[PDB]
Amino acid sequence: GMRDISAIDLVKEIKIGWNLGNTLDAPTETAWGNPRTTKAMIEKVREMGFNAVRVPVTWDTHIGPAPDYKIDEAWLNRVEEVVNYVLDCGMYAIINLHHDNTWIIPTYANEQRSKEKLVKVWEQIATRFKDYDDHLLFETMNEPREVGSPMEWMGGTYENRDVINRFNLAVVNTIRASGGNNDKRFILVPTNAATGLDVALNDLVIPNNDSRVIVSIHAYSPYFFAMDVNGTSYWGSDYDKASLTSELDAIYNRFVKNGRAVIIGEFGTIDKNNLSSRVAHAEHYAREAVSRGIAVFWWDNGYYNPGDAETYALLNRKTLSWYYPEIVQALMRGAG
Secondary structure: OOOOOOHHHHHHHHOEEEEEOOOOOOOOOOOOOOOOOOHHHHHHHHHOOOOEEEEOOOOHHHEOOOOOOOEOHHHHHHHHHHHHHHHHOOOEEEEOOOOOOOOOOOOOOOHHHHHHHHHHHHHHHHHHOOOOOOOEEEEOOOOOOOOOOOOOOOOOOHHHHHHHHHHHHHHHHHHHOOOOOOOOOOEEEOOHHHOOOHHHHOOOOOHHHOOOEEEEEEOOOOHHHHOOOOOOOOOOOHHHHHHHHHHHHHHHHHOHHHOOOEEEEEEOOOOOOOHHHHHHHHHHHHHHHHOOOOEEEEEEOOOOOOOOOOOOOOEEOOOOEEOOHHHHHHHHHHHO
16 A cells, blocks of 8 residues: 655645645534534545645544543544545545644643653554555644744744654654554654744754655745735735745755655635635645645635635535635646
Protein backbone atom coordinates (compact mmCIF):
# COMPACT_ATOMS: atom_id res chain seq x y z
CA GLY A 1 0.00 0.00 0.00
CA MET A 2 3.09 2.19 0.24
CA ARG A 3 4.38 3.33 -3.16
CA ASP A 4 7.97 4.32 -3.86
CA ILE A 5 7.01 7.99 -4.07
CA SER A 6 8.76 11.08 -2.78
CA ALA A 7 6.79 13.58 -0.66
CA ILE A 8 7.15 16.19 -3.43
CA ASP A 9 5.39 13.97 -5.95
CA LEU A 10 2.77 12.87 -3.45
CA VAL A 11 1.83 16.48 -2.71
CA LYS A 12 1.55 17.31 -6.45
CA GLU A 13 -0.88 14.43 -6.70
CA ILE A 14 -2.96 15.70 -3.78
CA LYS A 15 -3.26 19.11 -5.44
CA ILE A 16 -6.55 20.42 -4.03
CA GLY A 17 -8.42 19.38 -0.90
CA TRP A 18 -11.32 20.24 1.41
CA ASN A 19 -11.57 20.50 5.23
CA LEU A 20 -14.37 18.94 7.19
CA GLY A 21 -14.30 21.99 9.49
CA ASN A 22 -16.17 22.55 12.79
CA THR A 23 -16.99 18.88 12.94
CA LEU A 24 -14.69 16.38 14.67
CA ASP A 25 -12.66 19.41 15.78
CA ALA A 26 -15.82 20.41 17.72
CA PRO A 27 -16.33 19.00 21.27
CA THR A 28 -18.83 16.59 19.68
CA GLU A 29 -19.58 16.13 15.97
CA THR A 30 -22.79 18.22 16.03
CA ALA A 31 -21.84 20.74 18.76
CA TRP A 32 -20.98 23.55 16.33
CA GLY A 33 -24.08 23.20 14.16
CA ASN A 34 -22.88 20.65 11.60
CA PRO A 35 -25.06 17.54 10.99
CA ARG A 36 -23.69 14.04 11.55
CA THR A 37 -21.32 13.46 8.64
CA THR A 38 -22.38 11.02 5.91
CA LYS A 39 -20.53 9.32 3.07
CA ALA A 40 -22.99 11.18 0.80
CA MET A 41 -21.52 14.56 1.81
CA ILE A 42 -18.03 13.31 1.12
CA GLU A 43 -19.13 11.97 -2.28
CA LYS A 44 -20.38 15.42 -3.27
CA VAL A 45 -17.04 16.84 -2.22
CA ARG A 46 -15.30 14.27 -4.47
CA GLU A 47 -17.83 14.79 -7.25
CA MET A 48 -16.71 18.42 -7.62
CA GLY A 49 -13.04 17.63 -8.25
CA PHE A 50 -11.44 17.66 -4.82
CA ASN A 51 -8.74 14.99 -4.41
CA ALA A 52 -8.44 15.02 -0.62
CA VAL A 53 -10.25 15.66 2.64
CA ARG A 54 -8.61 16.96 5.79
CA VAL A 55 -10.37 15.66 8.88
CA PRO A 56 -9.36 17.86 11.80
CA VAL A 57 -9.89 16.04 15.08
CA THR A 58 -10.03 17.47 18.59
CA TRP A 59 -9.39 14.74 21.15
CA ASP A 60 -9.50 16.76 24.43
CA THR A 61 -12.79 15.71 26.10
CA HIS A 62 -12.57 12.12 24.92
CA ILE A 63 -9.28 11.53 26.71
CA GLY A 64 -9.26 9.58 29.94
CA PRO A 65 -7.26 10.57 33.01
CA ALA A 66 -3.52 10.15 33.48
CA PRO A 67 -1.42 8.03 33.35
CA ASP A 68 -2.82 5.97 30.46
CA TYR A 69 -4.80 8.76 28.75
CA LYS A 70 -7.04 6.18 27.14
CA ILE A 71 -9.05 7.60 24.23
CA ASP A 72 -12.80 6.82 24.34
CA GLU A 73 -13.16 3.98 21.86
CA ALA A 74 -16.48 5.22 20.49
CA TRP A 75 -14.83 8.51 19.52
CA LEU A 76 -11.82 6.80 17.92
CA ASN A 77 -14.13 4.45 15.97
CA ARG A 78 -16.13 7.40 14.67
CA VAL A 79 -12.93 9.11 13.56
CA GLU A 80 -12.02 5.87 11.77
CA GLU A 81 -15.49 5.65 10.17
CA VAL A 82 -15.26 9.19 8.70
CA VAL A 83 -11.72 8.58 7.42
CA ASN A 84 -13.11 5.63 5.54
CA TYR A 85 -15.81 7.81 3.97
CA VAL A 86 -12.94 9.76 2.36
CA LEU A 87 -10.65 6.90 1.39
CA ASP A 88 -13.50 4.90 -0.08
CA CYS A 89 -14.18 7.86 -2.38
CA GLY A 90 -10.61 7.41 -3.62
CA MET A 91 -9.38 10.64 -2.03
CA TYR A 92 -6.42 11.35 0.23
CA ALA A 93 -7.16 11.87 3.94
CA ILE A 94 -5.36 13.80 6.68
CA ILE A 95 -6.12 13.45 10.39
CA ASN A 96 -4.65 15.50 13.17
CA LEU A 97 -4.91 16.74 16.66
CA HIS A 98 -6.64 20.06 16.46
CA HIS A 99 -8.09 22.25 19.26
CA ASP A 100 -6.05 20.46 21.91
CA ASN A 101 -4.21 23.58 22.98
CA THR A 102 -5.80 23.20 26.44
CA TRP A 103 -3.29 20.45 27.24
CA ILE A 104 -0.70 21.02 24.54
CA ILE A 105 1.18 23.96 25.96
CA PRO A 106 4.47 24.81 24.20
CA THR A 107 6.38 26.39 27.12
CA TYR A 108 9.42 25.09 28.99
CA ALA A 109 7.42 24.66 32.22
CA ASN A 110 4.70 22.59 30.60
CA GLU A 111 6.82 20.74 28.05
CA GLN A 112 7.11 17.42 29.87
CA ARG A 113 3.47 17.29 30.91
CA SER A 114 2.13 17.96 27.45
CA LYS A 115 4.76 15.84 25.64
CA GLU A 116 4.10 12.77 27.76
CA LYS A 117 0.37 13.18 27.14
CA LEU A 118 0.99 13.91 23.48
CA VAL A 119 2.98 10.65 23.21
CA LYS A 120 0.35 8.44 24.79
CA VAL A 121 -2.48 9.92 22.70
CA TRP A 122 -0.58 9.54 19.41
CA GLU A 123 0.49 5.96 20.25
CA GLN A 124 -3.20 5.00 20.21
CA ILE A 125 -3.98 7.08 17.13
CA ALA A 126 -0.95 5.86 15.13
CA THR A 127 -1.67 2.29 16.16
CA ARG A 128 -5.35 2.26 15.11
CA PHE A 129 -4.40 3.47 11.65
CA LYS A 130 -1.09 1.60 11.23
CA ASP A 131 -2.30 -0.66 8.40
CA TYR A 132 -3.85 2.03 6.12
CA ASP A 133 -2.13 2.79 2.80
CA ASP A 134 -0.28 5.95 1.82
CA HIS A 135 -3.52 7.86 1.09
CA LEU A 136 -3.87 8.46 4.78
CA LEU A 137 -1.58 11.06 6.27
CA PHE A 138 -0.91 12.09 9.84
CA GLU A 139 -0.53 15.75 10.86
CA THR A 140 1.27 15.97 14.22
CA MET A 141 -0.54 19.09 15.58
CA ASN A 142 -2.89 21.77 14.18
CA GLU A 143 -1.88 25.24 15.30
CA PRO A 144 0.40 24.69 18.30
CA ARG A 145 0.85 27.90 20.22
CA GLU A 146 0.74 29.48 23.68
CA VAL A 147 -2.94 30.41 23.92
CA GLY A 148 -3.50 33.87 25.35
CA SER A 149 0.11 34.93 24.92
CA PRO A 150 1.18 38.28 23.45
CA MET A 151 2.89 36.58 20.47
CA GLU A 152 0.25 33.88 19.94
CA TRP A 153 -0.74 34.97 16.44
CA MET A 154 2.58 36.59 15.56
CA GLY A 155 4.79 33.49 15.43
CA GLY A 156 5.30 33.05 19.17
CA THR A 157 8.57 33.40 21.08
CA TYR A 158 11.66 31.26 20.56
CA GLU A 159 10.48 29.38 23.64
CA ASN A 160 7.27 28.44 21.86
CA ARG A 161 8.93 27.36 18.65
CA ASP A 162 11.66 25.48 20.46
CA VAL A 163 9.20 23.34 22.43
CA ILE A 164 7.06 22.69 19.36
CA ASN A 165 10.07 21.12 17.58
CA ARG A 166 10.34 18.55 20.39
CA PHE A 167 6.58 17.90 20.46
CA ASN A 168 6.91 17.18 16.73
CA LEU A 169 9.97 15.02 17.21
CA ALA A 170 8.26 13.03 19.92
CA VAL A 171 5.17 12.50 17.80
CA VAL A 172 7.21 11.58 14.72
CA ASN A 173 9.32 8.99 16.59
CA THR A 174 6.10 7.71 18.20
CA ILE A 175 4.38 7.21 14.82
CA ARG A 176 7.50 5.65 13.28
CA ALA A 177 7.69 3.04 16.07
CA SER A 178 4.02 2.04 16.07
CA GLY A 179 4.25 -0.67 13.40
CA GLY A 180 2.49 -1.51 10.13
CA ASN A 181 2.97 1.19 7.48
CA ASN A 182 3.82 3.86 10.01
CA ASP A 183 7.51 3.53 9.16
CA LYS A 184 6.63 4.88 5.75
CA ARG A 185 3.50 7.10 6.28
CA PHE A 186 3.76 10.76 5.28
CA ILE A 187 3.46 13.25 8.16
CA LEU A 188 2.70 17.01 8.25
CA VAL A 189 4.44 19.20 10.85
CA PRO A 190 3.95 22.94 11.66
CA THR A 191 5.75 25.51 13.75
CA ASN A 192 3.88 27.98 15.99
CA ALA A 193 0.23 28.36 14.89
CA ALA A 194 1.15 26.72 11.56
CA THR A 195 2.31 30.18 10.54
CA GLY A 196 4.04 30.81 7.24
CA LEU A 197 5.96 33.75 8.67
CA ASP A 198 9.54 33.36 7.50
CA VAL A 199 11.37 34.33 10.71
CA ALA A 200 9.26 31.77 12.57
CA LEU A 201 10.00 29.08 10.02
CA ASN A 202 13.68 29.76 10.69
CA ASP A 203 13.38 27.76 13.89
CA LEU A 204 11.40 24.80 12.55
CA VAL A 205 13.45 21.60 12.45
CA ILE A 206 12.41 18.56 10.46
CA PRO A 207 12.46 15.68 12.98
CA ASN A 208 15.31 13.31 12.18
CA ASN A 209 15.48 15.01 8.72
CA ASP A 210 12.76 12.44 7.92
CA SER A 211 12.41 12.57 4.14
CA ARG A 212 8.63 11.92 4.18
CA VAL A 213 7.84 14.89 6.40
CA ILE A 214 5.88 17.73 4.88
CA VAL A 215 5.83 21.34 5.97
CA SER A 216 2.37 22.27 7.19
CA ILE A 217 1.40 25.89 6.73
CA HIS A 218 -1.90 27.73 7.14
CA ALA A 219 -2.30 30.91 5.11
CA TYR A 220 -5.57 32.83 4.88
CA SER A 221 -3.97 35.53 2.74
CA PRO A 222 -4.66 38.31 2.44
CA TYR A 223 -5.96 38.59 5.99
CA PHE A 224 -8.24 41.63 5.64
CA PHE A 225 -9.96 40.43 2.49
CA ALA A 226 -10.18 36.80 3.61
CA MET A 227 -10.94 36.69 7.34
CA ASP A 228 -11.95 40.10 8.60
CA VAL A 229 -15.66 41.01 8.34
CA ASN A 230 -14.67 44.68 8.52
CA GLY A 231 -11.82 44.30 6.01
CA THR A 232 -12.23 45.27 2.34
CA SER A 233 -14.56 43.22 0.17
CA TYR A 234 -12.57 43.63 -3.03
CA TRP A 235 -9.66 41.51 -4.19
CA GLY A 236 -8.23 41.55 -7.70
CA SER A 237 -5.79 44.41 -8.21
CA ASP A 238 -2.30 43.95 -9.69
CA TYR A 239 -0.93 44.48 -6.19
CA ASP A 240 -3.16 41.70 -4.78
CA LYS A 241 -1.92 39.31 -7.43
CA ALA A 242 1.77 40.16 -7.01
CA SER A 243 1.45 39.98 -3.24
CA LEU A 244 0.35 36.36 -2.78
CA THR A 245 2.65 35.26 -5.65
CA SER A 246 5.60 36.76 -3.76
CA GLU A 247 4.45 34.98 -0.59
CA LEU A 248 4.37 31.66 -2.42
CA ASP A 249 7.74 32.24 -3.99
CA ALA A 250 9.21 32.58 -0.52
CA ILE A 251 7.72 29.23 0.44
CA TYR A 252 8.75 27.67 -2.92
CA ASN A 253 12.37 28.94 -2.86
CA ARG A 254 12.89 27.87 0.76
CA PHE A 255 11.32 24.40 0.88
CA VAL A 256 10.01 22.91 -2.35
CA LYS A 257 12.96 23.99 -4.49
CA ASN A 258 15.22 22.03 -2.13
CA GLY A 259 13.05 18.93 -1.91
CA ARG A 260 10.88 19.67 1.13
CA ALA A 261 7.15 19.25 0.35
CA VAL A 262 4.71 21.85 1.69
CA ILE A 263 1.00 21.60 2.42
CA ILE A 264 -1.19 24.61 2.96
CA GLY A 265 -3.72 22.78 5.10
CA GLU A 266 -6.04 25.79 5.55
CA PHE A 267 -7.01 28.85 3.50
CA GLY A 268 -10.22 30.50 2.39
CA THR A 269 -12.44 33.58 2.54
CA ILE A 270 -15.60 34.52 4.41
CA ASP A 271 -18.84 35.56 2.68
CA LYS A 272 -18.88 39.35 2.31
CA ASN A 273 -21.51 39.60 -0.42
CA ASN A 274 -18.53 39.74 -2.77
CA LEU A 275 -18.77 36.55 -4.85
CA SER A 276 -16.78 37.98 -7.78
CA SER A 277 -13.79 38.81 -5.58
CA ARG A 278 -13.96 35.43 -3.87
CA VAL A 279 -14.13 33.60 -7.20
CA ALA A 280 -11.11 35.46 -8.59
CA HIS A 281 -9.25 35.08 -5.31
CA ALA A 282 -9.89 31.37 -5.25
CA GLU A 283 -8.63 30.71 -8.76
CA HIS A 284 -5.38 32.68 -8.38
CA TYR A 285 -4.69 30.91 -5.06
CA ALA A 286 -4.93 27.37 -6.44
CA ARG A 287 -3.08 28.15 -9.70
CA GLU A 288 -0.10 29.75 -8.06
CA ALA A 289 0.27 27.12 -5.31
CA VAL A 290 -0.14 24.10 -7.54
CA SER A 291 2.17 25.56 -10.21
CA ARG A 292 4.69 25.51 -7.34
CA GLY A 293 3.90 21.95 -6.27
CA ILE A 294 1.97 23.08 -3.18
CA ALA A 295 -1.34 21.44 -2.30
CA VAL A 296 -4.11 23.63 -0.85
CA PHE A 297 -7.09 22.69 1.32
CA TRP A 298 -10.17 24.95 1.66
CA TRP A 299 -11.48 25.62 5.17
CA ASP A 300 -15.23 24.67 5.20
CA ASN A 301 -16.86 24.98 8.62
CA GLY A 302 -20.35 24.37 7.27
CA TYR A 303 -21.50 27.89 8.27
CA TYR A 304 -23.59 29.86 5.77
CA ASN A 305 -24.99 33.31 6.58
CA PRO A 306 -23.96 35.92 3.96
CA GLY A 307 -22.23 38.97 5.41
CA ASP A 308 -21.54 37.42 8.80
CA ALA A 309 -18.17 36.54 10.26
CA GLU A 310 -16.64 33.05 9.77
CA THR A 311 -18.79 32.28 6.74
CA TYR A 312 -16.43 29.85 5.02
CA ALA A 313 -18.96 27.23 3.93
CA LEU A 314 -19.10 26.02 0.32
CA LEU A 315 -21.01 22.79 0.89
CA ASN A 316 -24.60 22.84 2.20
CA ARG A 317 -24.36 19.62 4.17
CA LYS A 318 -28.00 19.14 5.14
CA THR A 319 -29.18 19.41 1.52
CA LEU A 320 -26.18 18.03 -0.43
CA SER A 321 -25.96 21.10 -2.64
CA TRP A 322 -23.40 23.87 -2.92
CA TYR A 323 -23.99 27.39 -1.65
CA TYR A 324 -21.15 28.61 -3.85
CA PRO A 325 -20.30 26.17 -6.69
CA GLU A 326 -18.77 29.18 -8.45
CA ILE A 327 -16.01 29.20 -5.86
CA VAL A 328 -15.53 25.42 -6.15
CA GLN A 329 -15.26 25.57 -9.90
CA ALA A 330 -12.75 28.43 -9.57
CA LEU A 331 -10.50 26.27 -7.38
CA MET A 332 -10.70 23.48 -9.96
CA ARG A 333 -9.82 25.89 -12.77
CA GLY A 334 -6.71 26.92 -10.90
CA ALA A 335 -5.55 23.48 -9.84
CA GLY A 336 -6.02 22.27 -13.39
